[PDB]
Design a protein around this nucleic acid. Sequence first.
RNA 1: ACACCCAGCC
Lengths: 240, 193, 248, 209, 49, 285, 114
Amino acid sequence: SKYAYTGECRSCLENSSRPTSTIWVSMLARGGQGAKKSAIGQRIVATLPYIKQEVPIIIVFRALGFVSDRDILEHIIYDFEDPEMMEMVKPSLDEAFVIQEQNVALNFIGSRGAKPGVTKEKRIKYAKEVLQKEMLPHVGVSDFCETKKAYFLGYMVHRLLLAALGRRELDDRDHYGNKRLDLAGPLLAFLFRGMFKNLLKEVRIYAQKFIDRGKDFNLELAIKTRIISDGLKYSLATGN
Amino acid sequence: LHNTLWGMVCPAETPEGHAVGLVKNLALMAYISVGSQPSPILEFLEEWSMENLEEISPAAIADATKIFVNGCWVGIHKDPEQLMNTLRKLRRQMDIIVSEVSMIRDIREREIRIYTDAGRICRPLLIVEKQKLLLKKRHIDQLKEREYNNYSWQDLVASGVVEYIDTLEEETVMLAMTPDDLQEKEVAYCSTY
Amino acid sequence: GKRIPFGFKHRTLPHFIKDDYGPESRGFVENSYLAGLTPTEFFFHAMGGREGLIDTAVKTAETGYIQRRLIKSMESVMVKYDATVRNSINQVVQLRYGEDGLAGESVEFQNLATLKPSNKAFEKKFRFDYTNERALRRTLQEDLVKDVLSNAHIQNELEREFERMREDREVLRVIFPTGDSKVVLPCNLLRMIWNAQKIFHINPRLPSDLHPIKVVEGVKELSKKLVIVNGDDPLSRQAQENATLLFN
Amino acid sequence: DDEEETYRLWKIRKTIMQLCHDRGYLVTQDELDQTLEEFKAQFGDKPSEGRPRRTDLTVLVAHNDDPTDQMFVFFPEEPKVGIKTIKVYCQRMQEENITRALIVVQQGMTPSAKQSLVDMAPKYILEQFLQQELLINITEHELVPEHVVMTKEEVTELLARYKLRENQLPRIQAGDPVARYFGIKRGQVVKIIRPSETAGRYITYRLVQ
Amino acid sequence: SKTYQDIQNTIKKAKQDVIEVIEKAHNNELEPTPGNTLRQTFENQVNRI
Amino acid sequence: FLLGQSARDAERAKDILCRLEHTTLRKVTANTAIYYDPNPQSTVVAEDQEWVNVYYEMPDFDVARISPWLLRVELDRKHMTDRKLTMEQIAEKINAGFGDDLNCIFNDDNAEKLVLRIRIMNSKMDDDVFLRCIESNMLTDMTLQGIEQISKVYMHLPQTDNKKKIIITEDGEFKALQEWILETDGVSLMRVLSEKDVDPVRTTSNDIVEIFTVLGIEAVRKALERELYHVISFDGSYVNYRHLALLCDTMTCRGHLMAITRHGVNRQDTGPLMKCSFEETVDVL
Amino acid sequence: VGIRFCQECNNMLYPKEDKENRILLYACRNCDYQQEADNSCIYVNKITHEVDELTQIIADVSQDPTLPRTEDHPCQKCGHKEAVFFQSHSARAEDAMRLYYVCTAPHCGHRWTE
RNA sequence: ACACCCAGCC
Ligand SMILES: [Zn+2]
Ligand SMILES: [Zn+2]
């Protein structure tokens, strides 16, 4: 593919309240021979969740709230006296020159989301939400878990650069220590979480239908006992 | 058949045909962790001589070793071996660390990854200290009379003579194939089992 | 194809030290099946066997599709009644099947006795000699040797035979530059000659009563009965000569 | 370079000689085996600027059956050949009313020159050959068997003998390297003689489409 | 028993030769063969032995 | 295959190998730099002072208004010796590729440090960025010698009697004479065939498209025959000749190479029903 | 070689030249800060094997149980008669099966090749 | 029907 030395992190929140979201920070292959493409080096891009096309990594870092490149390279690069990694990350900064502050970076992120829309503040909010609740949920979901996400993204880029320089071996999909085993417990939990969500949704619909109609509602009748029972039974019966 | 299937997956039991290799079977002593809460590990690490990410300048990360818990970068530590020895002691003593918690030190990269989530596959191994098994004749004598007693496997695990090793922690250990044939005194293949 | 890979961190198995390229570490089973395999080499043998099983169970799904595509490429090509090979659109694929006209179930492996020998050996072992009276009298009967030494037409015919054989040798050396004599041809002449020897109780010691002019005439007459491209016009004649050039 | 370029020119001229001979077009025996030293002496040794001008490399050849059918072999100086050059070369051709000729190009010709080659084929036939493709006699390769362009009467006799229609024969592309080497148009037939390991010789026929 | 002794001696000599080649390569005293890398040359030598 | 004396003498064969193998400026440069140098006389490198000073005495169109952006290349010793080049060839190639705007400065072959300086002549971001761009381009996409596609050409004696040259002696005995051969890892058949001292008769390619586009249709038929036979009889299995002949004739019956796929079988003039039974059923109908 | 940032907006410095003085200036391409260079280097590239692994190995590698130990190569500085040897396994070379030795003494760790 | 497993022989 066009990407050489890609890197991923199938992040999943501790309680698995959401499906696993994958960030795919990767490095472009040396295939472009434009005016100033191959001379500087290789650009680094990140395929964030719920965004339909790649974003340069420095834009994501700036969106996380780090404008000055000193702060960026103090997260990606840990050792100052190491010219090779600095030279290899030069293209990433050179591509992100046009983006200069946090809010414009947020606009960059949000303009390529699910919907283009019309106004600015709405997709500034969209970019803030997708970087706060969908990019690396396992390190932070709270409102002010930005420094931790910045450090983790820096570590990801550092691993990418180390792999590119050859200082690490690329991982194996088979090193069986990289594989987890979903047993009956986690699998049944996966069904039960969604199906309890369905039950709560049904209770909400029923009780809303009664409250707007202008009367108290009996809790016992709101609960559809069919849902959990004949959902778990169906899943264990058919195997789907 | 990857190398890391040693002791976790049977090298022989697979179907032949369109599903060869993809369908496997657990080894006879393979154990899959049900997971645990990483909270007590985090409290212990914070109480220990570890410094959190927000309390450090970025310049200090290079020399220090990173600490990952369940894949989440928690902080950094300046003395890796002391922390590793303490953590291993706690796990072997059935302290706040559950026996199924995998604990890994990538020395060549200055990383300490502590995995606690469910789904990891691990197997029990005897513990070796200075070229000698920690499983003495006393343990075997107690195990022989399991009936009319209360000694059992859990007492071996609590005695610190057997511990569950994960397939990914298995990368950082030296296994002796058999005790009285690989730990004798000769032109030694390895003196740090 | 390579030795056992370093699946772990620079180790084949946890039981070896890092950076061990020796025979035991990388999967050299020093034990026999009778003696039994030690655990590490047992695992490595299991890896090899698994590779074999994967190849067996995967190569079928490629080879079956290759075979089916080959079938459907030429399911209709057949030998029509003018001995040409044509597809369903009557487009000639080959003017004669296999370029000779012979089915593949009746041909055998044979050795050309003219391609390999050098000029001296070839002339010695293939040119009929008639100046030597003693040898020719040993091989042939008295009447036959008298006829051979008397007539000059027979001597000229034998010289013509050898000349034709020399041109045939040159043609063979053009056809086969590598020099291998192992060709595939319809009739086994050596085994048929042996069958003729045994059927008629031919004594290989006494002189024979076969006139060499009879051999020449018989071979020439036989060459006109082995027809692959029947006809009279020059084109058919040339095609017939080419189709049976090697056999002739 | 100097020596390498004249060696290239000599090899191209030798290949053109062999090409013309293989077409039945009368060339002298000595030209077929002109050595590098002989070429250097007769034409020059330094094409660096001016002594063997490629204009002086123009070759006239005639046909064995009749002197009237002649050709030209040309050598444009510049890498890229275009309408104005082709126009003047065909004007020179018209001055001597010759029909067929080749153009040996160093690098290639413009799409306009390619279009101008194709459109006026019935009036004067013109062939193209990149100089890279003429540094060897491809007909001398061991893979290439013996091609022989067979005349209309022989084709009629063949189709009568085998009772074949025109389009039932095997095909050969007009742009085939061997077809371009022999200079054959659509409708001609190439008698191909091959050596075979089961018959010894096999004569197949290919129709140009 | 003589055959088993011969096989054991052959395997011992082969292992000794492989250790010798490993020692030679560990000191950068192994001249690579033309057309192959040093690692490939070492692997070829071990495989041939 | 080598035609003349190079087929026997080893070092002529090595010369042919060097003349064929692609050798870009990579694998021969130790380390490059873009050292600033506002003036040529004073320089910025101690090791490049005296020979720089004596070279720049002659004002041969390299002093007038040269840009101060220097490019030091620092060629290697072992790689250059193995590849057997010298400074003047590289300078000539650089000048030819980039004209006179990239004047080249070199010291000698006797220096312990093989340096090489490149500047920009007076005649659009900046000179530094452009200099870096051309440095990368010259390091990657500049040919010193060889053919642009040949990658890892090898050399070995053919031990088996099938590949070595087979000839007839004066007495006619087939002699299994042994000669040098070369095997590449890339196909540029018409360039390699035209090279000096290379047999244009026995030089073949395992690739099939190159044979078709260079030699002919009958040539690719024969090459396909030989390649299929090589595949089948590699393990000792034997298949009668006529079946291979039929397959090769079928794929080359219609002038061009006809693949055994939908893209080659369904493009014939066969009836629609046969094609639809093959594959792509509804599209054909 | 050598990367440092301006003190105003803390962004990456870039090379530049002036015609009036003809002196290299590492100026910030974002803000309006300029400074005089002191190395006259812009872009140093290293094609052949100059990795210098001797200064790249972490001295704490000696205390890894999975590495071999030898007594035939004593430490040069502290004189300890035990060392841990290992290979590189880094890309960009894919060759040079050489041994790097690290002393196993605490408060030491001199790296040496041989 | 359909779908999904499992399994047999190559
Ligand atoms: Zn600034
Ligand atoms: Zn020491």
